[PDB]
Design brief:
The structure is a monomer. By secondary structure, the chain is α+β, with helices and mostly antiparallel strands. It has two domains: 1-98, Phosphorylase Kinase, domain 1; 99-288, Orthogonal Bundle (Transferase(Phosphotransferase), domain 1). The protein is built from eight helices and seven strands; from the N terminus they run E-E-E-H-E-E-H-H-E-E-H-H-H-H-H. It has helices at 57-73, 104-109, 132-151, 198-203, 208-223, 235-243, 256-265, 276-289, and strands at residues 15-22, 26-33, 43-50, 82-86, 93-97, 164-166, 172-174. It is globular and about 55 Å long. The relative contact order is 0.12. The chain binds the ligand CCN(CC)CCCNc1ncc2cc(-c3cc(OC)cc(OC)c3)c(NC(=O)NC(C)(C)C)nc2n1. The site of the ligand CCN(CC)CCCNc1ncc2cc(-c3cc(OC)cc(OC)c3)c(NC(=O)NC(C)(C)C)nc2n1 has 20 residues, from strand 1, strand 3, helix 1 and strand 5. It is found in: Cell membrane; Nucleus; Cytoplasm, Cytosol; Cytoplasmic vesicle.
C-alpha cells in the first residue's frame, strides 16, 4: 500500500474520470471538483495518469517515482504541473494539468498553411494561423521551461515537440521531465535518436548541454511547423551523418539569426553550446524584434 501525503491528496469522489487521451501507463481526461480549497465547487479539466491492467511492480514504482519527482521540482508556467493524487483505497491516480491543444508537433502541423494543388493534403485549411512572432514565442516559452527545469537540476533526456504540450491559452508546457532501444520508433513512427546529442548517443553522457542540443532540434521542428528531422534516414546512416559533422538545413521562413541559434545548440563541443539561460535571453530579445505582420 501507499502512504498518504496530505499536500497532494484529492478524495476519489472529487475526480470524474473521462475519455482516454492515450497509452508507459494510461492517461485519461477528467474533471476535478474542488482541487483548490477556493472553490471546493469549481470543476477543473485535468489529465490523470494511471496504470494499465497488466501493470508490473516496476510500472507502479515508475509512476510513484515520476509523481515524487514532480513534487520535488515545483511549479512553473512552462511545465506540466502536478495538481493532486488519489493514492488511498484504490488504484494510484496522478493528476496533472490538461493541455487541450495536444503536443507541440500536432499543434504546429494542424496550423500549417493551406494545401495547394501540389500538396499531400490539398484540402488542408486551418481556422487557426501562426505569425513569425508566435513561432519565436513558442521557442521562448519552451526555453523558459527548460531553464526552470535546469535550475532544479533536472535533465530531460528527451526534449522534442512531442514532449511539449499546448494549453487552451497557447501556453507551452514541457512534459515527461521526470521519467534504451535506438531502433524503437515513436507513436508517430519517428526515431527519438534524431533528437540526441552525439555525446548522449555515443557515450551515454546526458547533461543540460545535451538537452540544449535536443532544443536545437526542437527549434528546427518549430520553424518547419512540425517537420520530421532527417526523413528516410535509418539509425546507422544517422550515426554516420553525426560522425561526419552533418547539420540539418536551414528551414525556409527562418532567419539567419535563428538558424545560427540552432547551429550553436548543435556545437560539436558541449561546453561551447549556449545555456538555457542564454537562449531565454536571446529569445526574449528576438521575440520583441520579430514581425507579427506575417
Ligand atoms: C483530446 C484532445 N487532444 C488534442 C489534440 C489531445 C489532448 C491531450 N492533452 C493532454 N494534456 C495533458 C497531458 C498530460 C500528460 C502528462 C504529462 C506529464 O508530464 C510531467 C506527467 C503526467 O503524469 C504524471 C501526465 C500526458 N501524458 C501522456 O503520456 N499522454 C499520452 C499517453 C497521450 C502520450 N498527456 C496529456 N495530454
Amino acid at each position: 500500500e501507499l502512504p498518504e501525503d496530505p499536500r497532494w491528496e484529492l478524495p476519489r469522489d472529487r475526480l470524474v474520470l473521462g475519455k482516454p487521451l492515450g497509452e508507459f501507463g494510461q492517461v485519461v481526461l477528467a474533471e476535478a471538483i474542488g482541487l483548490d480549497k477556493d472553490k471546493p465547487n469549481r470543476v477543473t479539466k485535468v489529465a490523470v495518469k494511471m496504470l494499465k491492467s497488466d501493470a508490473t511492480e516496476k510500472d507502479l514504482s515508475d509512476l510513484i517515482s515520476e509523481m515524487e519527482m514532480m513534487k520535488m521540482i515545483g511549479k512553473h508556467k512552462n511545465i506540466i504541473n502536478l495538481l493532486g493524487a488519489c493514492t488511498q483505497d484504490g488504484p494510484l491516480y496522478v493528476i496533472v494539468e490538461y493541455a487541450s491543444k495536444g503536443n507541440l508537433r500536432e499543434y504546429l502541423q494542424a496550423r500549417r498553411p493551406p494545401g495547394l494543388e501540389y500538396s499531400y493534403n490539398p484540402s488542408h485549411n486551418p481556422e487557426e494561423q501562426l505569425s513569425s512572432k508566435d513561432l519565436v514565442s513558442c521557442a521562448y516559452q519552451v526555453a523558459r521551461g527548460m531553464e526552470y527545469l535546469a535550475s532544479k537540476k533536472c535533465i530531460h533526456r528527451d526534449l522534442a515537440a512531442r514532449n511539449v504540450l499546448v494549453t487552451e491559452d497557447n501556453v507551452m508546457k514541457i512534459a515527461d521531465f521526470g521519467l534504451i532501444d535506438y531502433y524503437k520508433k515513436t507513436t508517430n513512427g519517428r526515431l527519438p535518436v534524431k533528437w540526441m546529442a552525439p555525446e548522449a548517443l555515443f557515450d551515454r553522457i546526458y547533461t543540460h548541454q545535451s538537452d540544449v542540443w535536443s532544443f536545437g532540434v526542437l527549434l528546427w521542428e518549430i520553424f518547419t511547423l512540425g517537420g520530421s528531422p532527417y526523413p528516410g534516414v535509418p539509425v546507422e546512416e544517422l550515426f554516420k551523418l553525426l560522425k561526419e559533422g552533418h547539420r540539418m538545413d536551414k528551414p525556409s521562413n527562418c532567419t539567419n539569426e535563428l538558424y545560427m541559434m540552432m547551429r550553436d545548440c548543435w556545437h560539436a563541443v558541449p561546453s561551447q553550446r549556449p545555456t538555457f539561460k542564454q537562449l531565454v535571453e536571446d529569445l526574449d530579445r528576438i521575440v520583441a524584434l520579430t514581425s507579427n505582420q506575417e
